[PDB]
Design a protein around this ligand. Structure first.
Ligand SMILES: Fc1ccc2c(c1)[nH]c1ncnc(N[C@@H]3CCOC3)c12
Ligand SMILES: [Cl-]
Length: 167
């Protein structure tokens, strides 16, 4: 039993809700919140901009030190950093950005990072400003993630479309 409330169950391990991931993280304080990161951990907009803003820029400060030490992530890769006031940990995961020409096949690799954590609160990778089809992202999530994932979808119209079209 966990504290996630109001989710629709899609499969044995995948759950979905129309919610603002920032507000969901602040309420649940999950062990892991997933950020829709880029390789530079520059949290300017989309989910990343919103999560970072909610940490009063502490996420960005920590991220800049991480990059200065380690260099950029790989597309499809991830790193674990602090969750600040939102979660115990933040798993920064880089899905391919279609608006940069990146291979959509890398979306499966990106979701594989979730399997290193038993339970996660997450957005749909590569959705929103990353330019991929969210219906496809949900399909890859369900077919790749085996651990327990709670998906927060900000847009109500999109949430209803994802549920109604789910096979
Ligand atoms: F300021 C922002 C900007 C983007 C998001 C945000 C707050 N909170 C989010 N929570 C979950 N998923 C998100 N990204 C996808 C976009 C379409 O539906 C889901 C966002
Ligand atoms: Cl977005």
């Amino acid at each position: 039993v966990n504290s996630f409330s109001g989710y629709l169950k899609l499969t044995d391990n995948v759950y979905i809700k129309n919610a603002d991931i920032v507000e969901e993280a602040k309420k649940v304080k999950p062990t892991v919140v997933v950020n829709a990161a880029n390789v530079y951990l520059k949290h300017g907009g989309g989910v990343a901009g919103a999560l970072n803003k909610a940490t009063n820029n502490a996420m960005q400060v920590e991220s800049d030190d991480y990059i200065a030490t380690n260099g950029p992530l790989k597309v499809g890769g991830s790193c674990v950093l602090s969750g600040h006031n939102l979660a115990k940990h933040c798993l920064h995961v880089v899905g391919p950005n279609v608006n940069k020409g990146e291979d959509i096949q890398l979306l499966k690799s990106a979701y594989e990072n979730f399997n290193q954590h038993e339970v996660l609160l997450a957005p749909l990778l590569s959705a929103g400003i990353f330019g991929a089809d969210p219906i496809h992202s949900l399909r890859v999530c369900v077919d790749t993630v085996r651990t327990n994932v709670y998906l927060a979808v900000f847009d109500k119209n999109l949430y209803d479309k994802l549920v109604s079209s789910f096979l």
